[PDB]
Design a protein around this ligand. Sequence first.
Ligand SMILES: C=C1C[C@]23C[C@H]1CC[C@H]2[C@@]12CCC[C@@](C)(C(=O)O1)[C@H]2[C@@H]3C(=O)O
Ligand SMILES: O=C(O)CCC(=O)C(=O)O
Length: 343
Amino acid sequence: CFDFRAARRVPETHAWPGLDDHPVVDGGGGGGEDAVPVVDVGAGDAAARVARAAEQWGAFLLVGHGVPAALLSRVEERVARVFSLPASEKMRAVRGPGEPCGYGSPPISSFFSKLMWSEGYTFSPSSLRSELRRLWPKSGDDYLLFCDVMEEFHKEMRRLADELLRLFLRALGLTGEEVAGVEAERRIGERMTATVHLNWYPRCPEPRRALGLIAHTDSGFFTFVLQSLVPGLQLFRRGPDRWVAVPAVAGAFVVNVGDLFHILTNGRFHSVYHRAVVNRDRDRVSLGYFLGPPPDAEVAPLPEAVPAGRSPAYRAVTWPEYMAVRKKAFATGGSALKMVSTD
Ligand SMILES: C=C1C[C@]23C[C@H]1CC[C@H]2[C@@]12CCC[C@@](C)(C(=O)O1)[C@H]2[C@@H]3C(=O)O
Ligand SMILES: O=C(O)CCC(=O)C(=O)O
């Protein structure tokens, strides 16, 4: 389709009016009130740092996670490789209307009239080998290397995801022994599912006009973002309204808290609104690794998160139910969280 590589300007179909409505501030370590929080997952005070970041930002940089740097670099190379394929091959794996996986813009794109300056690809790690055969129907080197790197990455990330979930629950102020009780009763970590979305943001000749990824919250529990060392992720903060530019830090993931975790925590942990901007000089690739419940599980505020005497702030919803609420929210200009809230 549209050739991002050849465009010498951004055409009106790809031009967004609002983009500088709010100021952008630096979120590096010298950024003050707006330095993005960093959490070292192996530090003894990780739970406390996760608490503060989840409450005040809904996001944090994550270091010390143990995922080998050599593996992360191979992941980024494979991801770049998918998007350097010819258009004709990519379209062989197109994600058709309403389909969950394949090559194409993510589902938020269909709700907006202007088009994003990026490409995407969604797959589920649990059926990676079969899904990726749509892209490489005769298998071969690129296919086998891609599946090998993504399989190993999924094994490391699913473990990290279980470690982070335990930290998030501790960060509600529960002891390790109480968290074990929650996990034993609800099996949240045992049951959560992972989905991957790959993003390619090509260089853009008029960055003030184009938008890499439409501003949104993630719908699920929480997401790990792995990105090339080119900046572009921005996190919205209020009072006053502003975008915080997340720094590109070697060996960090960014964790974003999503809507269903806002529900799970009775509103305690913020679901972060975020977007990705393009840039003039460098392409960059990112991968989101999205955690959420299985399709049959109801998500409602945890009793341990609801203060004593108080009522739950949100109704119970399954993820498929909540996706329908999101779709309605996108069309009507509303907020899916408000729509399932008890007020
Ligand atoms: C598991 C997921 C999570 C999805 C839906 C599905 C696959 C792709 C994910 C994203 C990725 C990009 C933006 C978002 C808002 C989108 O449009 O697609 C995300 C969405 C969500 O957070 O709900
Ligand atoms: O590309 C980024 O840094 C944003 C990733 C993200 O927001 C997503 O893919 O949902």
